[PDB]
Ligand binder design. Structure first.
Ligand SMILES: *[C@@H]1O[C@H](CO)[C@@H](O)[C@H](O)[C@H]1NC(C)=O
Ligand SMILES: *[C@@H]1O[C@H](CO)[C@@H](O)[C@H](O)[C@H]1NC(C)=O
Ligand SMILES: [Cl-]
Ligand SMILES: [Cl-]
Lengths: 101, 122, 101, 122
């Protein structure tokens, strides 16, 4: 759809700093998933018996999450000699996923 | 009779109400300035610097006031501030910080000697 | 008027029966949670300098769930004098809570 | 073919979708029930009890289900809960807790012996 409140990918930047070495802070363009899933979340009671072990409730809930991502590297510029490397997932797509898969 | 209103939408309601062409970059029409401003929309969207949109507008549609013969643009410090956060994002896209926004061509700070708009240090 | 989309308690009657043994079913009033929480869900990458990465993302997601409930027990008469205890929960209130918290 | 939809607006989207007249108070038409419900609008507005609106609807347009011959109303405990918070406000206006909502004419709690809707203890 085209609903701006849907579960989709958003782009943002952040400043990254290594906490253990003295390095220049680094700007990095990142992506996140955010939105509202179309599926109503819900929860009902289950009935247990002596021979039927069941959880108190059966639940469903959809969350906006990364569907596909990709490892991405971040070379820092540090004390004049060295280069440290951060990594993180660059999100490529988002989807609505069951809360507890 | 000295200042014109701001006709560029993305530069309205930012702290001043009128401007004057030509701007600090050479454009003689707001329409030309608006067009070039659009090239910055993605960068602005990314949240690169909360000051970016204001800084660009202050350059492309500088503050005009009836009380003096020159336009009021950004101070060099705001430029550097924005640049340090924004240049790296541009480089990720294979672009340079444009020469037209060379921070060293702005007054270094707001005083009587030269009026320029500063922004927060943080 | 009340928003039919909010997280709320719905009421319904259903039958309590043993899914196998053969028994005297019993009619019972139940409640369930259903609706859309107002908080948007999201997921962000975490940046790591350390080995590899650990949990790649940090996320928040709200699910419509039972907040309080009454623990009920009842007895069915099954084939033969035998009586079987069934347990279930009567939901009293639903709220929006984090998926994984 | 046993239950009718709820045509009273202030009693829609509260947890059940159909009802059946006559209600627990005697009305044979939802239209009559709606009219009398309106007499409670101020009390509801005041935030007297978060359960008030639901409790009243459960009495004036009781839950109907195709699976049994009786309507489902509130349990006595919800009535008392609402009453204890709401009666005093009524008295401030020189009104009594109506006899039609006598809490003692509701089942005392939800079990197989008698279906009634409970609410939160707090
Ligand atoms: C503009 O910046 C470039 C690089 O920052 C530099 O070569 C030049 O000195 C600056 N312009 C002036 C007039 O200083
Ligand atoms: C209704 O309540 C009034 C006062 O609470 C009381 O006199 C009466 O006992 C109640 N009705 C019945 C049938 O008990
Ligand atoms: Cl910023
Ligand atoms: Cl309350």
């Amino acid at each position: 759809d085209s609903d701006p409140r849907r579960c989709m990918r958003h782009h943002y930047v952040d400043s990254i700093s290594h906490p253990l070495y003295k390095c220049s802070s680094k700007m990095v363009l990142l992506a996140r998933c955010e939105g509202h899933c179309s599926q109503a979340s819900r929860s009902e009671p289950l009935v247990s018996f002596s021979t039927v072990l069941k959880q108190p409730f059966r639940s469903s809930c959809h969350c906006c999450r990364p569907q596909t991502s990709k490892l991405k590297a971040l070379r820092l510029r540090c004390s004049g000699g060295m280069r440290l490397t951060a990594t993180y997932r660059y999100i490529l797509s988002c989807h609505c996923e069951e809360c507890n898969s | 009779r000295r200042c014109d209103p701001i006709r560029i939408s993305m530069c309205q309601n930012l702290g001043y109400n009128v401007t004057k062409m030509p701007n600090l970059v050479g454009h003689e029409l707001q329409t030309d300035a608006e067009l070039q401003l659009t090239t910055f929309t993605p960068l602005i969207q990314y949240g690169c610097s909360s000051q970016l949109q204001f800084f660009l507008c202050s350059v492309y549609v500088p503050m005009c006031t009836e009380k003096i013969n020159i336009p009021i643009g950004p101070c060099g410090g705001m430029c550097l501030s924005v640049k340090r956060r924004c240049e790296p994002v541009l480089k990720e896209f294979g672009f340079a910080w444009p020469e037209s926004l060379n921070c060293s061509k702005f007054p270094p700070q707001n005083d009587h000697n030269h009026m320029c708009m500063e922004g927060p240090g943080d």
